[PDB]
């Protein structure tokens, strides 16, 4: 296993971790600053957070997408290393007053994710925590599907002292997760990315969801979504799994909306 896992494993030579500095000053918690190098002596900017954790490692290292967050090592509490997020997480770039993306820019965000959740599906991976903070933007704006793996809890912060809104109706029920259940929570971000950020059901409890949804009440149009993008999330939070569109149906779809623009 030790074998096995050595392509992960990132020398301590080849790393400089700076544990003097945090990134995003406290946002994602003790996500340190680093360099890797590279074969070709090439400097990487990296994010280090200190944590069968090598064997979700093997797994991770092998899952290879522009629109998946890619995991360039671990170092042996153990390290992963990541690649750094210029412009941090999807949620807080779009509430962020002083960035103005087009309706355009919104849809081509939420294609990347399909394209990401795409690439996980095929690799028979489910994710279980898909929402608009779980998404990361590189320099380039490029979207990347994260908090899975090795790089989940993104948020979990240490004290001294379930995401039931974007969750599908059997998973609430049974506390079963599928690709199909991803495809509900792939609805609830493509409505968080039309509203710029906005909270799912703000006026229903976390324990009234249930409930509200077995009625047959649904998050409502955003006022910039096109109606061809919200009957493609309506399809999303249909109750039966099976009658729910694929992820790769969902990039055919999204990606012909995104051509209109
Ligand atoms: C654990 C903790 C934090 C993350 C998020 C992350 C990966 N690379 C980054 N670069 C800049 C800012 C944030 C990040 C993932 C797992
Ligand atoms: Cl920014």
């Known amino acids: 296993l030790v074998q096995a896992v050595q392509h992960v494993v990132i020398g301590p030579s080849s790393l400089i971790v700076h544990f003097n500095e945090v990134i995003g000053r406290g946002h994602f918690g003790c996500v340190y600053h680093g360099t890797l ?3 070709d002596g090439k400097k990487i900017h990296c994010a280090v957070k200190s944590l069968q954790f090598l064997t ?3 797994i991770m290292k092998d899952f290879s997408h522009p629109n998946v967050l890619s995991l ?4 042996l509490s153990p390290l992963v290393v990541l690649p750094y997020m210029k412009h941090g997480d999807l949620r807080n770039f779009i509430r962020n007053e002083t960035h103005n993306p087009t309706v355009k820019d919104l849809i081509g965000f939420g294609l990347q994710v399909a394209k990401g959740m795409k690439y996980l599906a095929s690799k028979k991976f489910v994710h279980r925590d898909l929402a608009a903070r779980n998404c990361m933007l590189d320099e380039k704006f490029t ?3 994260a908090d899975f793996g090795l790089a989940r809890d993104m948020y979990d912060k240490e004290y001294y002292s379930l995401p039931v809104k974007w969750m599908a109706l059997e998973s609430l029920q049974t506390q079963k997760f599928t690709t199909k259940s991803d495809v509900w929570s792939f609805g609830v971000l493509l409505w968080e990315l039309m509203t710029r950020g906005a909270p799912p059901y703000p006026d229903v409890n976390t324990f009234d969801i249930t409930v509200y949804l077995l009625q ?3 998050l ?3 006022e910039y979504c096109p109606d061809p993008l919200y009957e493609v999330m309506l399809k999303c939070w249909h109750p039966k799994a099976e009658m729910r569109p694929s992820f790769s149906e969902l990039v055919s779809r999204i990606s012909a909306i995104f051509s209109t623009f």
Do not use: A, F, H, S
């Open 56 to 58: 979700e490692g093997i």
């Open 216 to 218: 047959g009440r649904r």
């Open 72 to 75: 360039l090592g671990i170092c």
């Open 220 to 222: 409502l149009q955003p």
């Open 37 to 39: 190098l590279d074969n």
């Open 143 to 145: 979207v990347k599907v």
